[PDB]
Amino acid sequence: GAAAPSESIPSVNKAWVYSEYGKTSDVLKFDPSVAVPEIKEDQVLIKVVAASLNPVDFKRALGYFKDTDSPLPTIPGYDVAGVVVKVGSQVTKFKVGDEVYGDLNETALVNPTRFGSLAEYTAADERVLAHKPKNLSFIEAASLPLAIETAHEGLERAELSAGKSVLVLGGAGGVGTHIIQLAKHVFGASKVAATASTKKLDLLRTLGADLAIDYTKENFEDLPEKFDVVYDAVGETDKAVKAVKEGGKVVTIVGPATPPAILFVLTSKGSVLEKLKPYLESGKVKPVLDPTSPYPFTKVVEAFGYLESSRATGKVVVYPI
């Protein structure tokens, strides 16, 4: 992995951009000539192959965390998979040519980059990246980081460990599909229960849920069964706290959290992906793509519209970029 020739890396590229906060249908525009970010010394430049969308992209674009956001205009997109083309002088873990993936923003809600993954090139901290598993496509790899790390961190915060039971509220989304798989296949849960609507229950069982609960037909919190861990991915901590065992833990990713539930926001770390690599290589944990994926780079507004419907099954990915 010798340095690319310098003339070979462009200083402008195509990207999606918004210059004011609002709905993606209103503010998100294609710009054919946006600056390529200059890398810091602990960053790499990536030729983007694929990018995933996350709810945070549209919540950010609505201005929900303007006080700690980076300055507009913004090129959105947290999740990336692609090929390193340049490395900073302090980088030791990657070289030119490495295939990598990660969630660009260490702290999602505090100073996320101005130069996201919905662009031909992006700059990424070494610390957020991992080597792409050889058996995963770039679409599949891009689908993973933010969701799989959020799943992992929430389960660790809830102290899940072998033999325990877990209930997942929102099993069929980007995050929930990983909460199920990790709980069963990485944390050794004895029983995994999860909620979704009627047509999504077989998917939950396929991913590792022992009990798939149709929230449109029954109320999980009224079941006599109580769980060691409850992981809310839908914003119903009021009910989640009613489904936990005394001494158990409830975590949510959608606040506000009703004590004793806690809310957290993930910390993006390549080391988490690296820890998960064997499960990804063996297929014990699988990417989960929405049937509408991939969306071409021309169709980013449509991809966001679909995510914003709250009905995505696994991940919405944009490819080819």
Ligand SMILES: NC(=O)c1ccc[n+]([C@@H]2O[C@H](COP(=O)([O-])OP(=O)(O)OC[C@H]3O[C@@H](n4cnc5c(N)ncnc54)[C@H](OP(=O)(O)O)[C@@H]3O)[C@@H](O)[C@H]2O)c1
């Ligand atoms: N705090 C953090 O660090 C963090 C990190 C990631 C995500 N988040 C937040 O967590 C939430 C989930 O993100 P995500 O990427 O997984 O979203 P997503 O992929 O858009 O979630 C879509 C899924 O939600 C399901 N769903 C909707 N309402 C439901 C309900 N009442 N019960 C059960 N399932 C329900 C839908 O299944 P049905 O069609 O069957 O309803 C759909 O499959 C978002 O609000 C996001 O902002 C927070």
